[PDB]
From a paper:
AQPs are membrane-integral water channels that are present in all organisms where they facilitate passive flow of water across the membrane as a direct response to the osmotic pressure. These studies show that cpAQP1aa is a water-specific aquaporin with a unique fold on the extracellular side that results in a constriction region. The overall structure of cpAQP1aa shares most of the common AQP structural features; assembling as a homotetramer with each monomer forming a functional pore and consisting of six transmembrane α-helices (1–6) and five connecting loops (A-E).
A single file of water molecules is aligned within the pore of each monomer, indicating that cpAQP1aa is in a functional state. Loops A and C are partly disordered, with residues 34–37 and 108–112, lacking electron density, and these parts have been omitted from the structure. The pore constricts to a radius of ∼1.2 Å at the ar/R region, formed by residues Arg 187, His 172, Cys 181, and Phe 50, a width and residue composition that is typical for water-specific AQPs. However, when comparing the channel profile of cpAQP1aa with those of the water-specific channel human AQP4, the aquaglyceroporin human AQP7, and the ammonia-permeable TIP2;1 from Arabidopsis thaliana, a unique pore narrowing at the extracellular side is identified. As a result, Leu 117, Ile 176, and Gly 180 form a hydrophobic constriction region with a radius of 1.1 Å, ∼8 Å away from the ar/R region. The unique conformation of loop C is stabilized by a hydrogen-bonding network that involves Tyr 107 in transmembrane helix three, residues 114–119 in loop C, and Arg 187 within the ar/R region. In addition, the Arg 187 guanidino group forms hydrogen bonds to the backbone oxygens of Leu 117 and Gly 118.
Numbering used by the authors:
A (entry chain A), B (entry chain A), C (entry chain A), D (entry chain A): 1 to 34, 38 to 108, 114 to 226
Write the structure that this text describes.
């Protein structure tokens, strides 16, 4: 039964849309909330617990990538088809834009922005902070392992939290191109937006290649 | 042995009363503690760790719903009888009113209240923030799964924490009609109280229908 | 081989001494650190992560009670001998006094003290905040269960954290008579000290009786 | 196949280099971020979640020691060869120096420094705060156990977090000689640096001896 014609495939695409819409609605709500060094841990926790909770809730349905950089890492890791990667990323961008429009209707941590770093510094920070996330996703979901006895969704969520703690005061922490894209589109502010695509996507592919080709090869 | 006449049933109802009384006593104690943007993470953590701990302690006895919206989601998911849902919700409301009376004897995060949102905005925020909670409960307790290797009680507690991080600065975060009801009754302040019933109950039913009828169908 | 003459017994007593000394050294170091509403989450986390870590490290050797109220609950639950309970509590008091003397050599959260509550209010707060802890310990270690798939040490540590979030602004949060005793002895300040014995010990026994005689009977 | 000539050995050494570089890049980024009592929980969480995430990601490849004191404890515990300990520590020092150079290019929590304690007090604080970490690593990875049902990487990360909560306001919390070494080398400031070697290494060896020779003997 071909993937494009398969009920399970489109349920998985729907889970990604649903999960992304909730991820961005909840996280942006925390980030805009009710200045910005005070919010850093709260926001970091909100994004990380949002991913932990939605991956626990949907991961068995779609994988709960909720992140084009995770999806691209899985594609580079040959774990998903090109069709799945395209549809997941479309669903992620749509869900993020939908959530952003709800939450919103500059200023705060909703919109990723560089803070005291240049664009090329921001690209490197986003790359390393996404690299560690996609490395964790790939490693903790590696079907060869028998030693992942705790919660894989929680490990991924806490890696999202970690990426925020590291990057939020420099780039606002995107590590997720669809998460950056939603508020950019809604606010019609694409300043430095390419940083939040180039960095995370290179980091996600780099994580798949380093895990799979060097560290724990097939 | 009919449910109404069953010892295990009434032990489960008692666990819900006991667990709800402790959940609200401990969480309200943290929320009233010893202004309100400073408390947000502390309160969010207190409610989430309270649910994580009591679900770990009682979940094998009653399911540790401790939440009419979770109970209604389980009923919509056909996992509990109508009799169980009624008695659980009565036990939850009673436990919350009892705890509230102990803790108390406006002002703070004890009493859910709208803050800078309209009632219909508050209903939508409560709905989405409860939806993600009941989706997590239903998904993480789904008996078909074999992949929930970590702590299901902790996942649910962290989802409670997440719901607070998202909603607390807008609605005070109810996501739990009995949790809202206790302080409302004790303080005799039912202003906007219907928000904290309509939102969470619709969210809980919506979560059961979306999980069970669309995403991971039977 | 009689318990008093058994090598495993005295290794377990030694684990309790060692674990208690580290628990109090690390937690008091955080609590005295470098005013007190600002510290509440930090201190709450330090005590809870200290118990989570030491129970993960020693729980298979002694049970890692590290708490006379847990030990008394286990005795009321008929899971340890009277001899073990006595020696554990002596080891816990000694370890706490030793650690306190190291850390120290009023003022702060090192010494449990009532803050804006009467002694009888403090007894009830300590009782409920210990009750939920010992209920969690007993429930999560219940050998009949097969559903505790996550970390039992982490669940207990997070319950310790929860008890702090609830009680710290009222009583300083003892929920552990040996933890209260060390700084009291070192500071020679036993004001209201009986609160921190009566409350937690009644709570621990109450938790064993309610779990074992009512909720999940043998 | 001799260890020095083995592909798996050098993949493990590479994992340590990679994991250490990410651990220090991410943690130092959080610690320098964007004064120092405000940062304590954020920094404590960043270091602990960094270890939790990288140990979850790499632990099956190298053990994810990421810490000369853990490596020396494993050597004292006879779980790794002398060759492995040397190469791991070289890889850890190199990765930390590399990351430090990236992040940096006094002042803050990047560079471990004594704060209101003497060098010999700092040595004892570093020793106890490392002791509890290496005790946790050794205990939670003990292959004889069957009761470690949760996440071992998360337990170790939370122990790292705990060590920070205890030690950060006194020594900046090294508990990891390569983590101290990187910023010292990059900033060319080795003031009190021996504290951050002597304390943690003695603590790590002490943890192996106490676990293995006293508490849970072979």
């Amino acid at each position: 039964a071909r993937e494009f014609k398969s009920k399970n495939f489109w349920k998985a695409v729907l889970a990604e849309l649903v999960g992304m819409t909730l991820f961005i609605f909840l996280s942006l709500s925390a980030a805009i909330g009710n200045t910005n060094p005070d919010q850093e841990v709260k926001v970091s926790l909100a994004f990380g617990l949002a991913i932990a909770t939605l991956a626990q809730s949907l991961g068995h349905i779609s994988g709960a990538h909720l992140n084009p950089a995770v999806t691209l890492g899985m594609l580079a890791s040959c774990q998903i088809s090109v069709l799945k990667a395209v549809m997941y990323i479309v669903a992620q961008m749509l869900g993020s834009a939908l959530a952003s429009g709800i939450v919103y209707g500059n200023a705060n941590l909703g919109l990723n922005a560089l803070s005291g770093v240049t664009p090329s510094q921001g690209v490197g920070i986003e790359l390393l902070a996404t690299f560690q996330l996609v490395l964790c996703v790939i490693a903790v979901t590696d079907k060869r392992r028998r030693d992942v006895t705790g919660s894989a969704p929680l490990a991924i969520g806490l890696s999202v939290c970690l990426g925020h703690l590291a990057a939020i005061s420099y780039t606002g922490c995107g590590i997720n191109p669809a998460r950056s894209f939603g508020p950019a589109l809604i606010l019609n502010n694409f300043e430095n937006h390419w940083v939040y695509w180039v960095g995370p996507m290179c980091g996600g592919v780099a994580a798949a290649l380093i895990y799979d080709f060097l560290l724990a090869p097939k």
